[PDB]
Amino acid sequence: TPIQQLLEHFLRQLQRKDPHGFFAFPVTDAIAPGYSMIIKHPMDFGTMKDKIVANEYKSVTEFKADFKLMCDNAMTYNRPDTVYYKLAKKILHAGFKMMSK
């Protein structure tokens, strides 16, 4: 409610840190073999945007937990030497630094 524009801003800034759009939409098993056997709770920026515009986030805490879930799932599935794991680690750190007083 008082946080809706704040979260819209946080999402826009976090997506700017993923210019390639690798976190833009859900990862499917066709794109990533075995993904749904390893990752129990998928997340992506599109799903996060739908939750914002639906007023589904009750707090900044809840929003940060979905961002961290997204990045944690990428670091769990992908090997550390991959662009995907490296971006997830980098944007996790930077994003939380932005969103935390």
Binding site: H20, F22, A30, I31, A32, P33, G34, Y77, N78, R79, T82, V83, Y84
Partner: peptide
């Protein structure tokens, strides 16, 4: 086979 289909350079 544990990886993305593409290299993610584009």
């Amino acid at each position: 086979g544990r990886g993305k289909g593409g290299k993610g350079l584009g």
